[PDB]
């Protein structure tokens, strides 16, 4: 119900999350995906690397520049999954795709915005325990994506500042909860409690 919904791609199955995103864009929702390098695919890494090599060999024989485009980045791999669940050749499909941004890591300004998940598509909630899976960043680097290291480096710098921010927020919510704790037993507090608040 937010004007922009930011989805943290970690722990998400790629086809189940992108089918969720496809319906949201066609229903008019702006969706931003971050940490697409942390997406997941069911099946072993070698099995998924074999499927990308079957994709890699598909090219227009008389001119490889006009053929299928094999995008290596996890955000663009995610985008290719989305296309196929969106009628991208129509004007409505191009308007839906204009409502989506995907990213490796969390660039600004999404670093300081709340991220959500899709339990309808989470790997830990959909896969059976003991089933092998694959991380998109590992798959992408195996097929020529060149920025796993700098994404991992810049994510570490972001996580340090984010952890520092949460400590200064843990302290503030601790004080706020203490002020609410002493506010109880008053005249207003007992009326709110009898009214469910």
């Amino acid at each position: 119900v937010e004007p922009v919904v930011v989805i943290d791609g970690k722990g998400h199955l790629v086809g189940r999350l992108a089918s969720v995103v496809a319906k949201q864009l066609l229903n008019g929702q702006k969706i931003v995906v971050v940490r697409a390098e942390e997406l997941n695919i069911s099946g072993e890494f070698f099995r998924n690397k074999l499927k990308y090599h079957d994709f890699l060999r598909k090219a227009t024989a008389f001119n490889k520049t006009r053929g299928p485009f094999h995008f290596r980045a996890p955000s663009r791999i995610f985008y290719k999954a989305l296309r196929g669940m969106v009628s991208h050749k129509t004007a409505r499909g191009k308007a839906a795709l204009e409502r989506l941004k995907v990213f490796e890591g969390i660039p600004p300004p999404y670093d300081k915005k709340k991220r959500v998940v899709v339990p309808q598509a989470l790997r830990v909630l959909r896969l059976k325990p003991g089933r092998k899976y694959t991380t998109l960043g590992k798959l992408s680097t195996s097929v020529g994506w060149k920025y796993e290291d700098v994404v991992a480096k810049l994510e570490a710098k972001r996580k340090v500042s984010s952890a520092e921010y949460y400590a200064k927020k843990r302290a503030f919510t601790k004080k706020v909860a203490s002020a609410n704790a002493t506010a109880a037993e008053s005249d207003v507090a007992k009326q709110l409690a009898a009214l469910g608040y």
């Binding site: 024989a61 008389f62 001119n63 490889k64 520049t65 490796e104 890591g105 660039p107 060149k146 920025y147 700098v150 994404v151 480096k153 810049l154």
Partner: protein, 386 residues
């Protein structure tokens, strides 16, 4: 059905498209891997290919049947006057790729690099960098505000240099401006190097030494439109062939119903950027001295310039690099000399070279004298009057 007889493909698919280069100055696509321990130094140099000469040297290659005996080898001379450092650029690592964050320039720029930013220099008011030259007014307070930015950020530091084309015998008057990655030392030390070297001249012997494997980066000689027989080296068709024989007979099967990208077809030949590697330096010649072309075994007070000047180029009055063999490009052409991207240890590298004799006969013909004194000695007195 199959080809009925196997042959290797004509041409190399990795040098495609065989189109004209986007600029005459070929761009450096890769710099040597940076080792932070070493002192801060340039990784490339800019020079103008003057021409070729011939040397004699003793081969030091054990096992070779010509070991310890003289060989004659072709060399290429590139006029390399000391380039001027005029600026610095910092590059921040980004998931989208390397990206420049800011650039700093020297307070004063030479007219030969101010010409570069112009198409009509004579018509111009010469207004370039006038307001940037006012940033140095009080103490250059805006300049250290940007150098501190490069030091804090910018995991890569490059330096802006320009050639001293006013010293080379060219007819251009306008320098070539390039970026050279600055290897060694911390990010601060690279910026420290750049600040100390603003408005200064960096010589070629500070970058390169003798016997060093270096890379040549230049746009090759142009040949205009060319047919498939010379552009790709395909077989000439027989004499009986109607409607052309300098062609390719079959440019595809019926299916796929298209000409494929891998079929040899006519078009532009030459004027392509090329990066040739492993070119040993034979002489880091100094310009501020006679006996440029002298060796230990010659002791003749002659310069590197042949007897009558380099053909289509001119003399040499500056520092130069003698490099073994041929390098891409032609005479008068800007070339990038780049340090090796790997340490080669195959006894061709690591083979110290001592020149015995450098050919200084005229390349304008079948020149049979090295110096004017030698010509006057052999011929004697002529009718030409003093």
């Amino acid at each position: 059905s199959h080809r009925k007889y196997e042959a290797p493909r004509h041409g190399h698919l990795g040098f495609l498209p065989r189109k004209r280069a986007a600029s005459i100055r070929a761009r450096v696509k890769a710099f040597p891997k940076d080792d932070r321990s070493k002192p801060v130094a340039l990784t490339s140099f800019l020079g103008y290919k003057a021409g070729m000469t011939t040397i004699v040297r003793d081969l030091d290659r054990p096992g070779s049947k010509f070991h310890k005996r003289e060989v004659v080898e072709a060399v290429t001379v590139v006029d390399t006057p000391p380039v001027v450092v005029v600026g610095v650029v910092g590059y921040v690592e980004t998931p989208r790729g390397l990206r420049s964050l800011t650039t700093v320039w020297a307070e004063h720029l030479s007219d030969e690099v101010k010409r570069r930013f112009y198409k009509n220099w004579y018509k111009s008011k010469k207004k370039a960098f006038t307001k940037y030259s006012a940033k140095y007014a009080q103490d250059g307070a805006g300049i250290e505000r940007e150098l501190a930015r490069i030091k804090k950020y910018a995991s890569v530091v490059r330096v802006l240099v320009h050639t001293q084309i006013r010293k080379t015998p060219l007819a251009q008057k306008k320098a070539h401006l390039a970026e050279i990655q600055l290897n060694g030392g911390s990010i601060s030390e690279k910026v420290d190097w750049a600040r100390e070297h603003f408005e200064k001249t960096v010589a070629v012997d500070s970058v390169f030494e003798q016997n060093e494997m270096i890379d040549a980066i230049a746009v090759t000689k142009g040949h205009g439109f060319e047919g498939v027989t010379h552009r790709w080296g395909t077989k000439k068709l027989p004499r009986k062939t109607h409607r052309g024989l300098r062609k390719v007979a079959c440019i595809g099967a019926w299916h796929p119903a298209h000409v494929m990208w891998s079929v040899a077809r006519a078009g532009q030949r030459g004027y392509h950027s090329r990066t040739s590697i492993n070119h040993k330096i034979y002489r880091v010649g100094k310009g501020d001295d006679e006996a440029n072309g002298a060796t230990s075994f010659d002791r003749t007070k002659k310069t590197i310039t042949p007897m009558g000047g380099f053909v289509h180029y001119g003399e040499i009055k500056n520092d130069f690099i003698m490099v073994k063999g041929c390098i891409p490009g032609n005479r008068k052409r800007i070339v990038t000399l780049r340090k090796s991207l790997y340490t080669n240890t195959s006894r061709k590298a690591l083979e110290e070279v001592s020149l015995k004799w450098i050919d200084t006969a005229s390349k304008f013909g079948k020149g049979r004298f090295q110096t004017p004194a030698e010509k006057h000695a052999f011929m004697g007195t002529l009718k030409k009057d003093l």
